[PDB]
């Protein structure tokens, strides 16, 4: 192959997934693929015989800052600022030796990194290597981020109570959404600033989205980011099953085959989300009160003070519920049994659900999640946002609204229609197809 692309993921599930979907889409367009990855949280390389992996940054000589960090929880993510602050020299050496050791008929066209690797911009620049960025969060989230200076001056960033009102200058959000999203503003201000700055300075931004999903946000991206933006809905191309870091339960499909069509609520609150025991029990009570069948992925550590789901009484989630640890999520969402998805509103999950035409119930645990929940619930109207905590009646009502009630037909139909828009976008002539054609041509032009 004439042209090689190097991709550099953030080594967590929500970041490795999109970047290896992208790598596949690019391989299909005729690029060879090298993945630069930490040893930490590496995917299964035997799932990718067509890719070359090069492991970097935490190899066994290994700096003292990255040694001793836990492999899971919230502290595992301290690898990100550490690598941003200390990885530049090594990333440069690794890139250069690959650029030099390439064939006569082969060239390295570009580096694609996660947006959180803001340090890679200065490194790629120093090699005259073009860096493109993969955003793993939505265009709307970005639009909210660049509106922070106006939120600050309106005094929405102070923990003042105008919580239920539309935000002035940003009518799609309520003040509470902004409060929730930017609950650690003063803390994360500097690092978020760096990610934005270096994304703006990149050679192109690939968004895991499609035009017809976030059409209100496209002008912001054209205005605020001088580099070209490309929108590709990765889950429409292929699922992320090959980049799973955990063993799929898979016995779920036998259970799903015993369920009537559209009768199952899929429930998953996210990789690092945490609840008090009180709220965990309130969620379970909500699920039982809904009377719907459910498949609930609970990650160990979801319930504060418990290893897994110990506070649940025996048989409390009777015949119609199943709790598992891990599934091939998009494949589950594609299964005919699934009627809805109660999500924490992480962007991959949200987008997978959209691409599978599954309507949603939204909870959030901050960051971009309340913004995704607000946009999907109030703008697209493909789900119901439980935006006032956890209360069994409200939960049960939301589940039933989406899965059963005639009054929620609009939500179900909107989800079907939005899937169709995603499918159309991929076909020759569609917005994503053309965005991908432009990306391929753009990358091929960079030399
Ligand atoms: O049981 C599971 C739960 C999650 N996922 C995948 O893990 C990723 C989670 O990303 P997301 O952005 O939704 O949120 P995070 O969990 O990173 O907060 C998605 O691609 C899901 O499809 C999965 O394959 N199986």
Residue numbers in the entry: 11 to 169, 172 to 459
From the paper:
UGT76G1 is a UDP-glucose (UDPG)-dependent glycosyltransferase, where UDPG is the sugar donor and UDP is released after sugar transfer. UGT76G1 alone performs β (1–3) glycosylation of Reb D and Reb M in S. rebaudiana. The enzyme UGT76G1 shows an unusual degree of plasticity in substrate recognition; it is able to transfer a glucose to two different ends of some steviol glycosides despite having a single active site.
UDP sits across the two helices Cα3 and Cα4, contacting three β-strands (Cβ3, Cβ4, and Cβ5), and is perpendicular to the central six-stranded β-sheet of the C-terminal domain. The O2 and O3 hydroxyl groups of the ribose ring form a bidentate hydrogen bond with Glu 364, and a hydrogen bond forms between O3 hydroxyl and the side group amide of Asn 27. The pyrophosphate oxygen and two oxygen atoms of β-phosphate are linked to the NE2 of the imidazole ring of His 356 and to the amide and hydroxyl group of Ser 283, which is in the flexible loop between the Cβ1-strand and Cα1-helix. The interactions with UDP observed here are conserved in other GT-B fold glycosyltransferases.
